[PDB]
Amino acid sequence: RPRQYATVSKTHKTVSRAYGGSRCANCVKERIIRAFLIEEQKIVKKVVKEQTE
Amino acid sequence: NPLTHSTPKNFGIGQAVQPKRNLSRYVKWPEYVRVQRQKKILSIRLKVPPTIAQFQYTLDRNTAAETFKLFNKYRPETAAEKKERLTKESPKPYAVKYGLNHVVALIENKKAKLVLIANDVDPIELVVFLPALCKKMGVPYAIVKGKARLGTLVNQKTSAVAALTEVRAEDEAALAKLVSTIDANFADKYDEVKKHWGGGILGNKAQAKMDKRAKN
Amino acid sequence: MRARWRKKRTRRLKR
C-alpha cells in the first residue's frame, strides 16, 4: 500500500538500471535506441542543409 | 580551454526554453499605478481647452534656475529664527509671499511684483483663474515646475503659488531683468495662448497608423 | 523521500 513504501529499503522499490523503478526494461531500451538514432539523424539533417547552402 | 566547449542555445520557436527576458512592458501593475498612468494619457488624448492647455507651457530650466536663485534670498523665517526674534522683544522683513488666498488678494491690490504658479495643482481650479487675473491686474506671472519646489521656498511640503511684493534695493535690477524674461513667455503671449486648444495627441501605435495612411 | 524525512537528516548532520 502506498505508505508502506516509506518503511522499506531502497532495493525493494527499484532495480539497478536507468529509470529503475519507473520504466520497464523494454521501454528503457526503446528510449535509448530512439535517443541515439534521432540525435544521429540530426547531425545528418544539418549537414544536408549546410551542403545545399 | 580544451575541456570547455561552445554549446549555443537555439531560442527559436519550439526549441529551447526561452531565457529570462525583461518583461517590464507586460507587468500587470497594481490598479493604482494603472489609474495614474491612464489618467495622464486621457488628459492629452482629449482636446484640452485653452485655460487648461496654457499650463502645459512652463518656465525653461535656465530661467527657472535664475528665478529660484532670486526667491531663495527672500525665504520666510524658520521656526528657530522666530524663537530668536521674540527674545529680542526689530527691522522690516522682506519675504516671499505665499498662500493662495493671500496672493490672490495681493494681486487684486496690485501689490505683487512677480507671481509664480505651480503647474501641477490638483484640483486645477485653484489656479486656472490666476493667469487671467494677473493679466487683468498687470502683474508679471510665470508658470513654474513646482508645488513641491515652491514648498521648499517657504518651509512647506507644497505651495501652489509664491509672490514677491517688495525686494531689497540690492536685488531690484535682478528682479527687473527676470520680469522682462518672464513677461516674454507668459503675459506677452497670453492673448495668443488664450485661443489655442491643447491635447489631441495620439498614442504611439495610432500615430504610426496615421503616418502610414499619410504617405498613401 | 518526503520533505519531513529529508529535513530530519539535515538536522542530524547540522549537529
Binding site: - | 529570462k20 525583461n22 518583461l23 517590464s24 507587468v27 500587470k28 501593475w29 | -
Partner: protein, 119 residues
C-alpha cells in the same frame, strides 16, 4: 528602469514591528489555573476501585475534567512522591473524570493509598 523578469507584481516585503504596548493587557498574570491540587480532586473508594489498589497496583482518582494524561502523571508524582507507569482515563456517566493510574513496580499502591489514608 529596473529589470522585471516576471509579469507579476507582488506586494513588497515591508518591516513588521513587534508590539511595544503603552500598558499591560491585564494588570496581574493569572495564577496557575490547573495546579496539582486542582488536577486531583479525590480518590475513588468503591469496592471495585479498592480491588485495583490491592491487586493491580493501580490508584483510582477523580480528576479535573480539564486535566489530560500528562497533567495527571505530573500531579501524582508531585503530590504523592511516586512513579507512574501509565494513566488510563474515562469520563464517567455522572460527567466527572476518573483516572486509573498504574504505579511502577518500585512502589506499592496499597502502601501509598494507606498513606493518603483511605482503606
Amino acid at each position: 528602469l529596473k529589470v522585471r523578469t516576471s509579469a507579476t507584481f507582488r506586494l513588497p516585503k515591508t518591516l513588521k514591528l513587534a508590539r511595544a504596548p503603552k500598558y499591560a493587557s491585564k494588570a496581574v498574570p493569572h495564577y496557575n489555573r490547573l495546579d496539582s491540587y486542582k488536577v486531583i480532586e479525590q480518590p475513588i473508594t468503591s469496592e471495585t476501585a479498592m480491588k485495583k489498589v490491592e491487586d493491580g497496583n493501580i490508584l483510582v482518582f477523580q480528576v479535573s475534567m480539564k486535566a489530560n494524561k500528562y497533567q495527571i502523571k505530573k500531579a501524582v508524582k508531585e503530590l504523592y512522591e511516586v512513579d507512574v507507569l501509565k494513566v488510563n482515563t474515562l469520563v464517567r456517566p455522572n460527567g466527572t473524570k476518573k483516572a486509573y493510574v498504574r504505579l511502577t513496580a518500585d512502589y506499592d499502591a496499597l502502601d501509598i493509598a494507606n498513606r493518603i489514608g483511605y482503606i
